[PDB]
């Protein structure tokens, strides 16, 4: 049983609580799209873990690679270069758009956003950062100052020069220009305000192409392009955080490829590592050159470490061969349609959005009012669990709870249909 | 050859420069205390990589463990608990001193210091942090605000409430109380100043037991104890950063065990992972309880991930069995004596300090004046390389260049004597 | 002549330039609504100096009072109390609304706003201040951090916790709620944003009832009342800056009396001193009590100084007897109608707003587009001068230049008609 | 009686408490070196009010001048120039040292320091300010961030970039260089620390030549000169706050004349106004030129106002003719010797320091230990009052209470001897 009293004793006495609440089970092993409890029960992993397991759990190629390297090249002194590093950096250069040339290999998502934000502050000579009011960029220092979806209170003052703008949200429009939702004019209205408060030191803007934690909020048409143009006019860099969206998850290698807007700095994470701690920043030669002349510094213990780099190369080799970026669109369409059927069935589902395998279902009390369904989401989530479907819900102010759906890129037709079922039952039994 | 033009082409075109300068070689494989270039040449790794490879490179047990886990349990959703995590947390509870009860498993050194600093700001209700003027705590946001050895200019303003005090330095004493170096009175003098600038929100103090980047600066006798008492009187927490010192490196499990002063939060990193990206924070139940009631949040992608935790448990199992903490003292004494012989031989060596396998040699122009030897250090370092000894030098203002010596805990008698030789030759041929 | 070369020599060699540009004349003497140059030429003072000379220049009663006191009671030690001080404090208590009980007598406008902002930060235990994006609160430290109409760039970072919201502007509406300008919904939209960025330390809001520097922008109907309610809900104080509006200028003793919303702290200045350096803050006993228990401190050289207090009492005695608050409405209506006639005559006049003797004329290229008239304003201002009418124009982004009209409360029917003429001629001859 | 119950009622109900405690008396009139209560009792004003009444109270020339101007030229629009202003600016240029060329006329002490600090931040392009740990520069925003003697807690965070250094204190030496108090080495030690924390944006240093609030702490020999040199090396401006020291009070026009070190910006206040609200900043043409090109702005209601300027010119004309700067040295020597006699008599007096008519007596328990006399100071102060001597005591941490003695420059031989007596009696009757 998952009930092992010694286990839970030790967990209650020696683990620090960092947010949420531990599942009441012991994960014993994982494979593909499933995780197994102590009882042998398979739970269908519909969130790719913490939105990272792009190739699923324990993908045979990742196992080989970790193998070949653990006993060959593990960790090196920060100044020593090695093959996996140079190959990964190069590979990233070729698959990202033209304009993205040099990478820096690191460990976490927030570490990558910090490195990005520090290079832009160096390069520009300024320090003000702007982000969306429902963003998620990390727990560490600067990543946490541009984060607005959560953890903003009780921990002291934020970094100086921190500003936020509202994210364009179609589901629940708020800004209106002559009859309809004018997200571009909201953008201009927002920027006018920033401009009025800036002390003259705008340095960059970080943006998620799709706000994950913020409730799977997809940036509307023509938005990025217009955002990039606001940055251009002020001398600001545009950092795109593709931590949940890069590596095929939305039907393109990088979400920035859809819109056709290449950022100044692109940050990768979750999906790059496929479950491991790997991360990177990709930038243009021009910026890198400039950062180098001014003395840019981002030295860590794990920057350029063989193992991880080696893993990341494989992730990309697999994605490439197996053409998982296309699977993402196909499977992605399969999951979406089903979701919409569910919607036909139940009034609680108020919206289904996202792209490829990065979908979002917004639970609501009633479509007309579009009133948030208080605790119905927790029910659904509890029910899912009992049936063996691991989901995740995010809940923000003025919104209904949103389920984040992000199955592996390697999900099967069956697994998809399965989850779609469990989801149905859980919802049925929850009202 | 290490000369492979395609390699270097790609490295020159696609890598971001983050500090220092890449070695002009290609590391092909690593094992034990050596790294091998493209030519098959073995370079004796006298810095344990980036001061992490406590068990050396590719330690057979670490290879097994990475193996058993890559294909079993890799990465899980942040709320799911698993065995390696609970066992590691528990193990840490038992080996750290009484008073340290609950841990939080993470990925990097700076991530761990951030989590520590955020919990202290939560717990206390304040935000001012004090650190040494020659500290190294990380590149990320808050870790970078308490860092003073480097990267402090050109990247904007630091976090609000940042203060520093001078570290006690015996080698080059500066504060004098009636005839001699009064480090305790320096401490009091320093704290009076802080107290005069504080806005009334002192929350914590981060301190390295031995300042690594700051030139292997060991905190003198009775210092910690007195520091802890300054914190106690003001309501401040004491966070000890044992990133380079924990896990036996100085002859004790944790350096804090020597002085007999248990901190409020203890942070681990480099040596915990033994080369991998693992890190943690260890705290008292009382603080954890309190942080939990106030809503403490430190959610990342890799917090509580099977693989890494699993690795870390092994590191500690090995250390424990092979009694590497004692080897550290024995080998540690062997290296030290030799270093002192060198000192007899050459006038440039102005000081040899540190503890166990975490030694420091301070190059100087002449013992009397104790004048820093300008670029002689670079010579020595260049010469070492040619002979196959990988060393590392740090150079700060008002100091001579300091070689950081930190061979693996598994170093042999031979390897030690060998390095000691190469070191001699390199120094001989450099003047 | 005003041309005196020795004069201008000395002025060019020894005066620091602080903004704008010195008039090319020497004011030799002043009386009533006029100032006289070196040539004896009378210039009709249509701005009451720097919007302060509520009783005009050299009002016989102010001359007596300054007389009786200069040789009797001048300046005292900050702890010594005297009659003029206690009487002024009391008088202010009786004429301000119920709820405003205790005053603090000071010297300048920005000094008063600082004292207000520091008491609110003390009282609340927080530090975030919110103000309008086109506000003017002063040059000193905190007053300057809540100022947004100007001087915001090139002088370093602003105080931490500084935020701004757009002021409701009817002339050039920007926020739209279903067909029309919804200033209340703009308010809510604005506050949602603040709420999203706050670190949980909102302490107060400073607001001008009518934004003077911001282009005579009158806060629309039901606005204050709704603003006060936003503050109430968050635990924030409301500080009203009646520096240009208090003391009858808008047809009420205090502008806050119109709306019927009493602030938490009310700040007075310009009009209180009638040209001298006097200022004050008026607060509720409850807040004062509380500030006192927590150790509130605002000690200056001139706090509670006989002379000034004495002057201020007279200003108020005169206003009261001569019923200048009513004259303000009557004369105020006379000036307004004329202004509107002008408007009929010339297309450049795009709007005439304000209240009582605190009017604003917005120069524009053409009513339809409502395009700002580039430099036509400077013409008009130059022409006025030549004809002997002293005016003042403010020009902000996205607006046309606005003439601030604020003649003394003692202005005559004739003087008004006169100015109205000169104004006509100047405008006629300027296009 | 001073007891008038209506008075005290009104004072208890309508005055805001700003620090200290009101004297329990009603000052009815003042003249020369005395203030008179309601009972007609003359109290000898030994603090020149709030250290401002350099010519005493109600000096016949100041009365004429206030007279000639109140009914002639009072307050003008900020862009209009007038004679008293240009003459005052010029006069200041001629009497200050070579190198100080252009002035800006304002109202208060803290307003002047703000204007100074904002010009240095503009001119340099940086924002860090350094001051002494026992300084007093004002209550307003930036003046308050460089103030360290008091009001530093409970009102939120200070301005970013605020640092302090210890003031050189001979009475209670703390830094020691080989046997003795090495204030210059303290200076260097201090600056090394600043340098280690600076983010690379040091802009200026504000310093009082003699720390008044800090306990009449005179900057030791060769100090200023060395301070100025520390600023020179870093690109920092030196602002001297001569608010209590300028205008002859220490035996020179300006204290900076003693040391022979001309500052970059000199700030005047208290003594310039002689009791009124006048203040100014004096700077070099080079800085002014530069500030002007970059858009320097310091526009207030009272900048360049006839009345005050007019007063200030007279203050200086009187000082000049009556040769009060010399009287200051003569009377100054008379008061000092007497003080020292007192010292012979009573063991409580532990030190008598200062210069000219700006003296300080440090009450202590016993000369050997130099232990601060707890509440003996309050006794002495209470006793003085009863005898009719108005004194003032400041009390800081680690110090004994210090009496600030600063009689008018016009004090008579008799008045001096008188005070010296009362002082004796008060001290006698207090132990
Ligand atoms: C997960 C995530 C991060 C941070 O990654 P970590 O590994 O947790 O530091 C940053 N940004 C976004 C948008 C993320 O989704
Ligand atoms: C290496 C180090 C760190 C940071 O570890 P990273 O993995 O680089 O983030 C922090 N503190 C000390 C004292 C270190 O030596
Ligand atoms: C003029 C003014 C002030 C400042 O008064 P000063 O005497 O210049 O410091 C502050 N607020 C408003 C709204 C003003 O119009
Ligand atoms: C009194 C004083 C001030 C401030 O003058 P205020 O008129 O109170 O603003 C500033 N600095 C020093 C050194 C002072 O003594
Ligand atoms: Rb590395
Ligand atoms: Rb590219
Ligand atoms: Rb995890
Ligand atoms: Rb323990
Ligand atoms: Rb006073
Ligand atoms: Rb009232
Ligand atoms: Rb003026
Ligand atoms: Rb001069």
Q: What angle do CA B221, B227, B232 make, to 5 degrees?
A: 140
CB C20 within 8 A of CB D100: no
D207 token code pair:
């310093």
CB C298 within 8 A of CB C116: no
Q: Select the residue from C196, C202, C211, C215 to test the A interface by mutation, using most A Cβ atoms within 10 A.
A: C196
CB B118 within 8 A of CB B291: no
User: Can you state the angle between helices C83-95 and C306-321, rounded to 10 degrees?
Assistant: 40
CB D182 within 8 A of CB D107: no
- Element spanning D342, H or E: helix D324-345
Nearest CB neighbour to D199, from listed B152, B178, B200: B152
Residue D307 lies in a domain: yes
Proportion of chain D in helix, strand, coil states, percent, rounded to 5: 40, 20, 40
Instruction: Indicate if the alpha-carbon torsion angle D208, D214, D216, D217 is positive or negative.
Output: negative
In three-state secondary structure terms, A211 is: strand
In three-state secondary structure terms, B358 is: strand
Alpha helix ranges (H) inside D15-145? 48-51, 60-70, 83-95, 109-124, 141-145
How many Å apart are CA C22 and CA C11, to the nearest integer? Answer: 10
How many Å apart are CA C260 and CA C253, to the nearest integer? Answer: 12
Beta bridge partners of A22: none
How many Å apart are CA D391 and CA A228, to the nearest integer? Answer: 66
A145 token code pair:
């100052």
Mark which of D322, D339, D360 sits at the end of a domain. D322
Nearest-CA residue for atom 8 of ligand 4: C300
How many Å apart are CA B208 and CA B188, to the nearest integer? Answer: 19
Closest CA to A136 of A214, A219, A245: A214
Q: Hey, is the C-beta of D157 within 8 angstroms of any chain B C-beta?
A: yes
Distance from CA of A198 to the nearest CA of C (A): 8
How many Å apart are CA D424 and CA B67, to the nearest integer? Answer: 89
Q: How many domains does chain C have?
A: 2
Closest CA to A239 of A280, A290, A183, A192: A280
Centre of ligand 5 to C-alpha A204, Å, is 28
Alpha-carbon distances of C77 from A383, B290, C386, D34, D391, rounded to whole Å: 75, 50, 48, 12, 10
How many Å apart are CA B107 and CA B120, to the nearest integer? Answer: 20
Beta bridge partners of B358: B355
Closest CA to A385 of A22, A1, A36, A43: A43
Query: Given the CA of residue B109, which atom of ligand 2 is nearest to it?
Result: 5
Q: How many other C-beta atoms lie within 10 A of the C-beta of residue C222? A: 12
CB C252 within 8 A of CB C359: no
CB A243 within 8 A of CB A249: no
Q: Which residues contact B366 (CB under 8 A, 6 or more apart)?
A: B347
CB B220 within 8 A of CB B132: no
Beta bridge partners of C393: C403
How many Å apart are CA D97 and CA D266, to the nearest integer? Answer: 10
The ligand minimizing its distance to the Cα of B50 is 5
C93 token code pair:
């208590």
Closest CA to A237 of A290, A174, A158: A290
For ligand 2, is residue A369 a contact (CB within 6 Å)? no
Q: How many other C-beta atoms lie within 10 A of the C-beta of residue A70? A: 26
The secondary structure of residue D17, as a DSSP letter, is: P
Centre of ligand 6 to C-alpha B17, Å, is 17
**Residues of chain B found within 8 Å of residue D162, distances taken between Cβ atoms:** 197
Edge-to-edge order in the sheet of strand A279-283: A102-106, A279-283, A265-268, A237-241, A202-207, A128-132, A162-165
D384 token code pair:
């003085």
We report the CATH number of the domain holding residue A113 as 3.40.640.10
Q: Which residues contact B117 (CB under 8 A, 6 or more apart)?
A: B129, B142, B143, B146, B204, B206, B239
Closest CA to A94 of A271, A325, A317: A317
Q: Hey, is the C-beta of C431 within 8 angstroms of any chain D C-beta?
A: no
Partner-chain contact C197 A148, CB within 8 Å: yes
Examine the domain organization and report whether D240 and D372 are in the same domain. Answer: no
CB D381 within 8 A of CB D393: yes
Q: How many other C-beta atoms lie within 10 A of the C-beta of residue C275? A: 31
Tokens 């269908």 correspond to what residue? A44
B391 token code pair:
């060393």
Partner-chain contact A294 B74, CB within 8 Å: no
Q: What angle do CA D33, D38, D41 make, to 5 degrees?
A: 45
Partner-chain contact A30 B89, CB within 8 Å: no
CB C62 within 8 A of CB C315: yes
C42 token code pair:
């009378």
CB D388 within 8 A of CB D36: no
Q: Which residues contact C318 (CB under 8 A, 6 or more apart)?
A: C55, C59, C61, C324
The answer to whether residue D121 is catalytic is: no
Closest CA to B111 of A154, A120, A240, A109: A109
User: Can you state the angle between helices A83-95 and A306-321, rounded to 10 degrees?
Assistant: 40
Examine the domain organization and report whether A327 and A316 are in the same domain. Answer: no
Query: Chain D 95-124, CB below 8 Å of chain C: which residues?
Result: 101-104, 107-111, 114-115, 118, 121-122
How many Å apart are CA D21 and CA D15, to the nearest integer? Answer: 12
Examine the domain organization and report whether B344 and B246 are in the same domain. Answer: no
Q: Select the residue from D157, D178, D198, D215 to test the B interface by mutation, using most B Cβ atoms within 10 A.
A: D157
Closest CA to C421 of C342, C349, C366: C342
**Residues of chain C found within 8 Å of residue D37, distances taken between Cβ atoms:** none
CB A197 within 8 A of CB C162: yes
Q: Give the active site residue among C270, C327, C336, C355.
A: C270
Beta bridge partners of B56: none
The span from the first CA to the last CA of chain C, in angstroms, equals: 29
The answer to whether residue D270 is catalytic is: yes
Q: Give the active site residue among D45, D111, D128, D241.
A: D241
Partner-chain contact C161 A157, CB within 8 Å: yes
Q: Hey, is the C-beta of D181 within 8 angstroms of any chain B C-beta?
A: no
Q: Which residues contact C173 (CB under 8 A, 6 or more apart)?
A: C180, C181
**Ligand 1 pocket, residues with Cβ under 6 angstroms:** A 108-110, 113, 136-138, 208, 212, 241, 243-244, 269-270; B 300-302
Tokens 């006191």 correspond to what residue? C69
In three-state secondary structure terms, D113 is: helix
The ligand minimizing its distance to the Cα of A110 is 1
Strands C265-268 and D180-181: unpaired
Beta bridge partners of A372: A364
Instruction: Indicate if the alpha-carbon torsion angle B253, B255, B257, B258 is positive or negative.
Output: positive
Examine the domain organization and report whether B206 and B307 are in the same domain. Answer: yes
Q: Give the active site residue among B37, B101, B128, B208.
A: B208
Q: Hey, is the C-beta of A392 within 8 angstroms of any chain B C-beta?
A: yes
How many Å apart are CA A69 and CA B276, to the nearest integer? Answer: 12
How many Å apart are CA C67 and CA C72, to the nearest integer? Answer: 9
**Cβ burial, residue A354 (10 Å; 0-12/13-18/19+):** buried
Tokens 């409301």 correspond to what residue? C238
D357 token code pair:
């008519």
φ and ψ at residue A353, rounded to 5 degrees: -135, -175
Tokens 């806060």 correspond to what residue? C219
Tokens 């030519």 correspond to what residue? B39
Q: Hey, is the C-beta of B180 within 8 angstroms of any chain D C-beta?
A: no
Examine the domain organization and report whether B145 and B271 are in the same domain. Answer: yes
Please give the sequence-ordered ranges of beta strands (E in DSSP) within B79-201, or none if there are none. Answer: 81-82, 102-106, 128-132, 162-165, 176-177, 180-181
How many Å apart are CA D173 and CA D183, to the nearest integer? Answer: 9
Residue C234 lies in a domain: yes
Q: Which residues contact A191 (CB under 8 A, 6 or more apart)?
A: A165, A230
The DSSP secondary structure of A293-352, one letter per residue, reads HTT-----SSTT-HHHHHHHHHHHHHHHHTTHHHHHHHHHHHHHHHHHHHHHH-TTEEEE
Beta bridge partners of A238: A205
Alpha-carbon distances of C282 from C115, C132, C286, C306, rounded to whole Å: 10, 21, 12, 18
**Residues of chain A found within 8 Å of residue C154, distances taken between Cβ atoms:** 200
**Residues of chain C found within 8 Å of residue D302, distances taken between Cβ atoms:** 50, 108, 277
Tokens 């201090």 correspond to what residue? D190
Strands A102-106 and A128-132: unpaired
Partner-chain contact C164 A196, CB within 8 Å: yes
Q: Which residues contact D332 (CB under 8 A, 6 or more apart)?
A: D251, D355, D356, D357, D359
The whole-angstrom distance between residue C243's C-alpha and the CA centroid of its chain comes to 4
Beta bridge partners of B362: B402
Half-sphere exposure of D167 (CA within 13 A, CB side): 28
Residue D1 lies in a domain: no
Examine the domain organization and report whether C289 and C421 are in the same domain. Answer: no
Examine the domain organization and report whether C169 and C195 are in the same domain. Answer: yes
Proportion of chain B in helix, strand, coil states, percent, rounded to 5: 40, 20, 40
Q: How many other C-beta atoms lie within 10 A of the C-beta of residue D214? A: 23
How many Å apart are CA C47 and CA C357, to the nearest integer? Answer: 10
Q: Which residues contact D141 (CB under 8 A, 6 or more apart)?
A: C114, C140, C141, C142, C143, C144, C145, C159, D114, D159
Alpha-carbon distances of D198 from B175, C65, D224, D237, rounded to whole Å: 21, 52, 22, 15
The answer to whether residue B404 is catalytic is: yes
Summary count for chain A: helices (H), strands (E)? 15, 21
Mark which of D305, D322, D339 sits at the end of a domain. D322
CB A75 within 8 A of CB B276: yes
Length of chain D: 431
Q: What angle do CA C111, D215, D17 make, to 5 degrees?
A: 35
In three-state secondary structure terms, D19 is: coil
Q: How many other C-beta atoms lie within 10 A of the C-beta of residue D346? A: 13
Examine the domain organization and report whether C184 and C310 are in the same domain. Answer: yes
CB A128 within 8 A of CB A191: no
Residue B14 lies in a domain: no
Examine the domain organization and report whether D258 and D121 are in the same domain. Answer: yes
Q: What angle do CA A36, A40, A46 make, to 5 degrees?
A: 30
Residue A13 lies in a domain: no
- Dihedral of CA atoms C24, C30, C35, C39 in degrees, nearest 10, equals -60
Half-sphere exposure of D407 (CA within 13 A, CB side): 31
CB C95 within 8 A of CB C257: no
How many Å apart are CA D268 and CA D281, to the nearest integer? Answer: 6
Residue C17 lies in a domain: no
**Residues of chain B found within 8 Å of residue D145, distances taken between Cβ atoms:** none
Examine the domain organization and report whether C104 and C216 are in the same domain. Answer: yes
The answer to whether residue B244 is catalytic is: yes
A85 token code pair:
């590093």
Alpha-carbon distances of D374 from B50, D134, D394, rounded to whole Å: 57, 20, 12
How many Å apart are CA C151 and CA A175, to the nearest integer? Answer: 30
The whole-angstrom distance between residue D244's C-alpha and the CA centroid of its chain comes to 3
Query: Given the CA of residue D108, which atom of ligand 4 is nearest to it?
Result: 7
Q: Hey, is the C-beta of A151 within 8 angstroms of any chain C C-beta?
A: no
Over the range A165-196, which residues count as b (16 or more CB within 10 Å of their CB) and which as e? Answer: bbbbbebeeebbeeeebbbbebbebbbebbeb
**Cβ burial, residue D370 (10 Å; 0-12/13-18/19+):** middle
Alpha-carbon distances of C323 from B222, C31, C54, D412, rounded to whole Å: 77, 21, 13, 49
How many Å apart are CA C44 and CA D193, to the nearest integer? Answer: 59
In three-state secondary structure terms, D363 is: strand
Q: Which residues contact D24 (CB under 8 A, 6 or more apart)?
A: D2
The answer to whether residue D244 is catalytic is: yes
Q: Hey, is the C-beta of C42 within 8 angstroms of any chain A C-beta?
A: no
The secondary structure of residue A119, as a DSSP letter, is: H
Closest CA to A308 of A337, A287, A283, A277: A277
Closest CA to C346 of C366, C369, C332: C366
Q: Determination method here?
A: X-ray
The DSSP secondary structure of D211-245, one letter per residue, reads ETTTTSEEPPTTHHHHHHHHHHHHT-EEEEE-TTT
Examine the domain organization and report whether B86 and B42 are in the same domain. Answer: no
Tokens 């090109």 correspond to what residue? D293
**Residues of chain B found within 8 Å of residue A67, distances taken between Cβ atoms:** 66-67, 70
Mark which of C289, C322, C355 sits at the end of a domain. C322
Nearest-CA residue for atom 11 of ligand 1: A137
For ligand 2, is residue B138 a contact (CB within 6 Å)? yes
SS3 sequence of C365-397? EECCCCEECCCHHHHHHHHHHHHCEECCEECCC
Partner-chain contact A14 B300, CB within 8 Å: no
- Domain of residue C101 covers 59-322
Please give the sequence-ordered ranges of beta strands (E in DSSP) within C85-201, or none if there are none. Answer: 102-106, 128-132, 162-165, 176-177, 180-181
Partner-chain contact B160 D164, CB within 8 Å: no
The secondary structure of residue A60, as a DSSP letter, is: H
CB A282 within 8 A of CB B3: no
SS3 sequence of C175-216? CEECCEECHHHHHHHHHHHHHHHCCCCEEEEEECCEECCCCC
Biggest CA–CA distance in chain C, Å, is: 65
Q: Select the residue from A23, A138, A156, A284 to test the B interface by mutation, using most B Cβ atoms within 10 A.
A: A156
Q: Which residues contact D50 (CB under 8 A, 6 or more apart)?
A: C75, C76, C77, C78, C301, C302, D270
Q: Which residues contact B110 (CB under 8 A, 6 or more apart)?
A: A111, A140, A300, B137, B138, B139, B140, B143, B144
Strands A279-283 and C128-132: unpaired
How many Å apart are CA C416 and CA C409, to the nearest integer? Answer: 11
How many Å apart are CA C129 and CA C120, to the nearest integer? Answer: 10
CB C253 within 8 A of CB C247: yes
Residue B20 lies in a domain: no
We report the CATH number of the domain holding residue A357 as 3.90.1150.10
Residue B129 lies in a domain: yes
Partner-chain contact B161 A156, CB within 8 Å: yes
How many Å apart are CA C229 and CA C226, to the nearest integer? Answer: 5
Closest CA to A138 of A62, A232, A239: A239
The DSSP secondary structure of C231-282, one letter per residue, reads HHHHT-EEEEE-TTTTTTTTSSSSTHHHHT---SEEEE-HHHHBTBS-EEEE
The DSSP secondary structure of D308-321, one letter per residue, reads HHHHHHHHHHHHHH
Examine the domain organization and report whether C316 and C345 are in the same domain. Answer: no
How many Å apart are CA A156 and CA C106, to the nearest integer? Answer: 33
């Amino acid at each position: 049983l998952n009930d092992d009293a010694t286990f839970w004793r030790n967990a209650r006495h020696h683990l620090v609580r960092y947010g949420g609440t531990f599942e009441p089970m012991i994960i014993e092993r994982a494979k593909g799209s499933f995780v197994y409890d102590a009882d042998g029960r398979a739970i269908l992993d519909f969130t790719s873990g913490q939105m990272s397991a792009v190739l699923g759990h324990c993908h045979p190629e990742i196992v080989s690679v970790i193998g070949e390297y653990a006993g060959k090249l593990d960790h090196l002194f920060s100044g020593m270069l090695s093959r996996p590093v140079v190959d990964l950096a190069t590979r990233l250069a070729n698959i990202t758009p033209p304009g993205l040339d040099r990478a820096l290999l690191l460990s976490t998502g927030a570490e990558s956003n910090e490195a990005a934000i520090r290079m832009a502050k160096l390069v520009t000579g300024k320090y003000e950062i702007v982000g969306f009011a429902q963003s998620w960029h990390g727990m560490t220092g600067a990543a946490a100052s541009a984060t607005y979806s959560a953890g903003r209170k009780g921990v002291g003052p934020a970094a100086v020069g921190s500003f936020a703008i509202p994210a364009p949200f179609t589901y629940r429009p708020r800004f209106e220009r002559n009859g309809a939702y004018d997200y571009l004019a909201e953008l201009d209205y927002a920027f006018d305000l920033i401009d009025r408060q800036s002390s003259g030191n705008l340095a960059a803007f970080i943006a998620e192409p799709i706000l994950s934690s913020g409730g799977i909020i997809e940036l509307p048409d023509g938005y990025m392009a217009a955002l990039k143009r606001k940055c251009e006019a002020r001398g600001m860099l545009l950092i795109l955080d593709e931590a949940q969206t890069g590596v095929g998850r939305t039907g393109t290698m990088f979400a920035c490829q859809r819109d056709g807007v290449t950022p100044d700095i692109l940050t990768l994470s979750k999906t790059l590592g496929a479950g491991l701690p790997l991360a990177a920043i990709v930038t243009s030669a021009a910026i890198e050159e400039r950062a180098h002349e001014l003395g840019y510094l981002f030295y860590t213990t794990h920057v350029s470490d063989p193992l991880p780099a080696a893993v990341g190369l494989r992730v990309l080799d697999v994605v490439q061969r197996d053409g998982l970026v296309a699977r993402a669109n196909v499977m992605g369409d399969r999951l979406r349609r089903g979701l919409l059927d569910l919607m036909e069935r139940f009034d609680c589902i108020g919206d289904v959005r996202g792209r490829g395998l990065l979908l979002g279902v917004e639970i609501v009390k009633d479509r007309r009012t579009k009133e948030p369904a208080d605790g119905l989401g927790a029910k659904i989530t509890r029910e899912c669990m009992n049936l063996g479907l691991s989901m995740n819900i995010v809940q923000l102010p003025g919104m209904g709870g949103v389920f984040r759906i992000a199955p592996p890129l390697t999900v099967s037709e069956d697994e998809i249909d399965l989850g779609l079922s469990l989801l149905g039952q859980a919802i049925e039994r929850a009202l």
